[PDB]
Amino acid sequence: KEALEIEKNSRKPPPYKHIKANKVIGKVQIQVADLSEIPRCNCKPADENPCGLESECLNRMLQYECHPQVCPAGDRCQNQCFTKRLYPDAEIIKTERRGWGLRTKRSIKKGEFVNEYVGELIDEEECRLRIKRAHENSVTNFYMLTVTKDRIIDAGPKGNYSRFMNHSCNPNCETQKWTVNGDVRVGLFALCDIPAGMELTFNYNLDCLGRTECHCGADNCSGFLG
Amino acid sequence: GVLRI
Ligand SMILES: C[S@@+](CC[C@H](N)C(=O)[O-])C[C@H]1O[C@@H](n2cnc3c(N)ncnc32)[C@H](O)[C@@H]1O
Ligand SMILES: [Zn+2]
Ligand SMILES: [Zn+2]
Ligand SMILES: [Zn+2]
Numbered sequence: 001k002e003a004l005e006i007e008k009n010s011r012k013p014p015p016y017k018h019i020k021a022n023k024v025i026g027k028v029q030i031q032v033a034d035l036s037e038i039p040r041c042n043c044k045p046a047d048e049n050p051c052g053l054e055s056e057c058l059n060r061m062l063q064y065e066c067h068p069q070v071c072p073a074g075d076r077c078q079n080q081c082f083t084k085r086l087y088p089d090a091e092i093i094k095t096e097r098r099g100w101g102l103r104t105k106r107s108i109k110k111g112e113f114v115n116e117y118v119g120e121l122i123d124e125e126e127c128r129l130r131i132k133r134a135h136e137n138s139v140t141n142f143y144m145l146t147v148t149k150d151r152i153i154d155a156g157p158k159g160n161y162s163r164f165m166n167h168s169c170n171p172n173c174e175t176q177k178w179t180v181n182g183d184v185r186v187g188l189f190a191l192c193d194i195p196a197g198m199e200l201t202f203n204y205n206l207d208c209l210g211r212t213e214c215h216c217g218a219d220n221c222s223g224f225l226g
Numbered sequence: 227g228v229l230r231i
Contacts, residue, residue, distance in 0.1 A: 127228065145229035152228060175231045186231065208227035226227060 013092065013100045017158040020085065022185065024121045028151060033182025038067040041079075045072055051079035053111045065180040081113040082180045082187060088114060090161045093199065097215040099141060101199050102164040108194040114173050115162040117145055117186040119155035127152040131209070140212070147177060147184050162188055167225055168201035170218035175202055 024030055041059040043050045050073035051057040051066055059066050059079055066079040089105040108114060122130070127144055134142065143156035143163050155163035165173070165188065173188045188202060201216065206226020214225045 131228075142227065144227075146231070175229070177231050205230040206227040207230055226229070 114188040119153040167204040168216040171201040
């Protein structure tokens with residue numbers, strides 16, 4: 001008769017549409033630069049690792065992605081991460097107290113691009129409506145991230161593997177706001193070297209708009225999510 | 227709540 005035996009471990013996460021890039025919703029509009037507006041860095045195509053993590057790259061320093069038609073380095077440019085969508089291979093995992101999570105299948109170096117946070121791009125009003133409807137339906141998983149005050153990415157209905165990354169108070173990745181072809185997008189970047197097999201986490205820096213309990217396990221855990 | 231960068 002066991003309450004322990006009532007095995008309701010979902011064998012798979014609830015459905016979502018796995019998408020490559022953000023999808024604008026309602027009033028939210030498409031932001032695209034003219035090729036004439038893309039910043040050009042001063043890296044040289046002869047450089048070792050042109051526009052790389054260790055480089056002086058003026059674009060990378062200001063979190064601007066290079067456009068290959070613009071960059072002096074051509075297709076050798078190592079600052080095309082968002083557009084190339086080269087992500088370390090990742091795997092969805094089941095946790096006991098934090099739902100589904102995500103782990104890396106390979107080793108990742110400090111500062112390396114891990115993923116793009118993609119989803120439906122919605123305005124504040126739509127964000128609030130969605131949160132209200134979620135509370136009315138006793139939903140406890142939220143996938144909303146503010147890019148700017150009226151541009152919020154909702155990775156709930158549609159997203160990529162980044163939607164599975166859990167919150168940690170002592171994370172191994174962080175979000176950064178980058179400009180890519182005149183649009184503001186959100187990347188996840190490693191804060192440290194990460195061995196293959198490790199769960200990938202970031203600090204949500206949550207604006208709660210009461211608190212949810214945090215199970216991240218960190219020594220500095222506040223006890224509360226975000 | 228909503229995540230922030
Ligand atoms: C973006 S989702 C992450 C994936 C989610 N775990 C799932 O199963 O789909 C965020 C939600 O996961 C849960 N979560 C994430 N980090 C957590 C933590 N450290 N402790 C408790 N719950 C967490 C919360 O319900 C949060 O709203
Ligand atoms: Zn450069
Ligand atoms: Zn470049
Ligand atoms: Zn915590």
